[PDB]
Amino acid sequence: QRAIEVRTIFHMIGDVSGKSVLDLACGFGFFGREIYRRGAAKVVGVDISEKMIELAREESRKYGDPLEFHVRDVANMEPLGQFDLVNAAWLFNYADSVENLRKMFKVVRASLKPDGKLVAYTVDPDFSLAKGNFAKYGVNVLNERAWGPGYRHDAEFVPSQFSFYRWSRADYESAIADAGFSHFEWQKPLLEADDIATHPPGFWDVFQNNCLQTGLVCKP
Ligand SMILES: Nc1ncnc2c1ncn2[C@@H]1O[C@H](CSCC[C@H](N)C(=O)O)[C@@H](O)[C@H]1O
Incomplete structure (x- = not known):
């Protein structure tokens, strides 16, 4: 069910050959590991969860890849160096305040080479x-509650549960600018004619x- 998401992220990333890559909020390492499969020189993954990093390391042992993982809170992260690419699939919706969203963007900026990109x-x-609701597409959003200047959502995968935050476009764009990214662009998910042809008519109406x-791409 992640086909659109994968396609969009690798469209934004482009050619990874020989690059160094920081995969933030990496989970068991799905994107970092696939980025290595596609030619990256070096991949480091970070997640706040010790359990998730334990699985990420077990997965790297099972296929013998050279990914390195760290247990860190990205909002409050010990510096890890500078990378050509920072990938962050489902990081920023875990920022629990606009202040912490802004700190996460500053951490990303500090993690980028001058010619790199988020x-x-x-x-x-x-x-x-x-x-x-998005349940038809894999995420059952259970509720929507005002949370300061944003919204909080409880949700679950179609049944593992989780909670996340929906900050405003203006607050994201202020966080981006104030962290020192001189360019950003929002990317619509890459729903394609083939996806439409292989699903019942109108299946993707809510998705659209x-x-x-x-998606979001930011450059220093
Ligand atoms: N402040 C924070 N710093 C680092 N990781 C965080 C975080 N808050 C949440 N996370 C992690 O973000 C992940 C979201 S799930 C996304 C996992 C992976 N990128 C994938 O797409 O497959 C969870 O594994 C969670 O532990």
Whole structure:
């Protein structure tokens, strides 16, 4: 069910050959490991969860890849160096305040070579629970509650549960600018004609009219 998401992130990333890559909020390492498979020179993954990093390391042992993992809170992260690429699939929606969203963007900037780039996948600020739930596409959004200047959502995968935050487009763009990224662009998920042809008609209507997801590319 992650086909669109994978396609969009690797579209944003482009050619990884010979690059150094920091995969933030890496989970068991899905994106970092695939980025290595596609030719990256070196991949480091970071996650706040000790359990997730324990699985990430077990996965790297099982296929013998050279990924290195760290247990760190990205918002409050010990410096790890500078990379050609920072990948952040489902990092920023875990920032629990606008202040912590802004700190995460500053950490990413400090982690980038001058010619590097951030590729991110996060919650679309324009998502509105009343316009259509996302359960049909893999994420059952259970509720939507005002949380300071943003919104908090409880959700679950179709049944592992989790909670995340939907900050406004203006707050994301201020965090980006104030962290020192001189260029950014929002990327619509890459729903393609083949996806439409292989699903019942109108299956993707809510995905198009009320997408939970968005891509984001930022450059110093
Ligand atoms: N402050 C923080 N710093 C680092 N990781 C965090 C974090 N808050 C949440 N996470 C991690 O973010 C992950 C979101 S799930 C995304 C996992 C992976 N990038 C993938 O797409 O497959 C979880 O594994 C969670 O432990």
